[PDB]
Swiss-Prot record, chain D:
The keyword rRNA-binding does not apply. The chain holds residues 209 to 351 of 528 of the full protein. Sigma factors are initiation factors that promote the attachment of RNA polymerase to specific initiation sites and are then released. This sigma factor is the primary sigma factor during exponential growth. It comes from Mycobacterium tuberculosis (strain CDC 1551 / Oshkosh). This is RNA polymerase sigma factor SigA. The keyword Cytoplasm applies.
Swiss-Prot record, chain E:
DNA-dependent RNA polymerase catalyzes the transcription of DNA into RNA using the four ribonucleoside triphosphates as substrates. This is DNA-directed RNA polymerase subunit beta'. Belongs to the RNA polymerase beta' chain family. The RNAP catalytic core consists of 2 alpha, 1 beta, 1 beta' and 1 omega subunit. When a sigma factor is associated with the core the holoenzyme is formed, which can initiate transcription. The gene is rpoC. Signal peptide: none annotated. The chain holds residues 343 to 391 of 1316 of the full protein.
From Swiss-Prot, chain F:
Forms a complex with the RNAP catalytic core and with free principal sigma factors. Belongs to the RNA polymerase-binding protein RbpA family. The gene is rbpA. This is RNA polymerase-binding protein RbpA. It comes from Mycobacterium tuberculosis (strain CDC 1551 / Oshkosh). Pfam families: RbpA (PF13397). Keywords: Transcription, Transcription regulation. Transmembrane segments: none annotated. GO terms for biological process: positive regulation of DNA-templated transcription. GO terms for molecular function: bacterial-type RNA polymerase core enzyme binding. Binds to RNA polymerase (RNAP), stimulating transcription from principal, but not alternative sigma factor promoters.
Amino acid sequence: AAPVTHIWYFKGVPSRLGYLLDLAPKDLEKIIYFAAYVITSVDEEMRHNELSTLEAEMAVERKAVEDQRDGELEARAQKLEADLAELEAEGAKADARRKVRDGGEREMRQIRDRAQRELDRLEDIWSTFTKLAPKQLIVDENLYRELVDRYGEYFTGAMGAESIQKLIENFDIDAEAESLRDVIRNGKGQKKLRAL
Amino acid sequence: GFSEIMRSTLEKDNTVGTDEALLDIYRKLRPGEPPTKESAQTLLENLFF
Amino acid sequence: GAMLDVNFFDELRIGLATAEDIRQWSYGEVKKPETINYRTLKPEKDGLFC
Amino acid sequence: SEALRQARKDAELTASADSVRAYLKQIGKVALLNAEEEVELAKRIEAGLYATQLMTELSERGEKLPAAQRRDMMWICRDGDRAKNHLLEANLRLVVSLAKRYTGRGMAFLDLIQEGNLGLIRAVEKFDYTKGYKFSTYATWWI
Amino acid sequence: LYRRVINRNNRLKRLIDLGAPEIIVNNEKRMLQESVDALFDNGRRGRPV
Amino acid sequence: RVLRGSRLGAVSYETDRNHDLAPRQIARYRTDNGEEFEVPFADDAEIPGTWLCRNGMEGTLIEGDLPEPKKVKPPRTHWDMLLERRSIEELEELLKERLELIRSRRRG
């Protein structure tokens, strides 16, 4: 019902599937055993001529997060101003008042590094969407699910033996053949030995 | 008290801490398990004594 | 090719078999995990002995 | 400290040959529920099934399609399936805890787990909440 | 080995016709792949059947 | 001492004659994906309409004679399990409550 790789051309030394696709065997084992997705195809031209609008929407979402966290910091500043005004108006301990002020400061620092983590997540998914190349592994699958629903129409990514079948399907042999000919022509050291 | 072998391994001990030694023993003996400071010290008494 | 094999040979060429040749050698799709009848000891329909 | 953190991170990112370890790591993500959430999800399931049955009797020349009514009944019909999948992904751990003792004879442990999963799909098909009971006591029988 | 391949293939066909979340279908396809691997060469990938 | 085995199959001994046999026809069956297969049936024998092909899928006969197409029913649905345990008034109650909830969540 679903395709299946041969065990003979995958789990030998050298792995012939890994040599034909130039992929490491400990990543091929993660692909064909449903442990990590792979990029079966990519569309460089649509990302190429729409990347300005896409990074504009990225900047829109990132600035919305910036405005939301500025409102969060202003809300914590208003709450700490109310804490100071209700702390220094009655008879209270200045050590406990400093602890209240430091609690408000830890609240707004939690706000700011949570916002920093959200911005780092958005810039990380943007960095990966820029560096989206075929034969790339996307481990832990949540970044992949966050990267499918945004821009599903610009790339495809599968997992397993059907992905390996599609990778072999959209594969020219003469291109990598002449490329390896050029590399063994103009190489030296370990690189030429692996290309041989 | 009388061998350069044990003195050189003493200067090459490289891991300070008895509880750190229990954690290192647990992390070396058992693979793929998050270490804990409670069950590691009970493991060694369950293994050899 | 030769499927009768009357004692004249020149070459024994190995090669990697494809899905078309695999479903072209076959005489039918086996589709049940049954081997034999437990009572009458006859092969089941669409089983591994059909 | 972070030494135990990097130790647990290095030990947790280890690859072995057991597929069942990967399966348990897979199912250990979604947390368990409570009875009110089970009631809400079953409400969503039955509402989505009634909405797609309304779409079934609507797919003939039963009525013209208003835009907002069409799109939000599509939203309810799609929400019911997500609730169904949520309930299944919740009680996968109960399936494993039931299948863990029928080993030792004949079948493989993953095969036992998979047939328990199929029984759990049947149990969430024929589960009812208006008897006011917990889901696990009903699903243990079918598993 | 042939019975295990036939059983897991039939169960995968039933699961696809039924419609299931991704965890079940991925586990079933992994079990199918390992069954075919054990049929062609037992004991190659990890512990033998 | 010695242990013997026997496959459950009788073994005859005759002469493989090639000349005088019972004569036989040939019919062509057609599958869904354009596959054709030829099955030698005996002469004094009924030609069945459908026939399970070598391909594994069921293949009809190449000459149109219109046998019984389906003569079956769908087994069971989750909608059938829902409908056999509750009433359509209860279903409409849950539907109207869910419609008011999506209304108050969307624009209300």
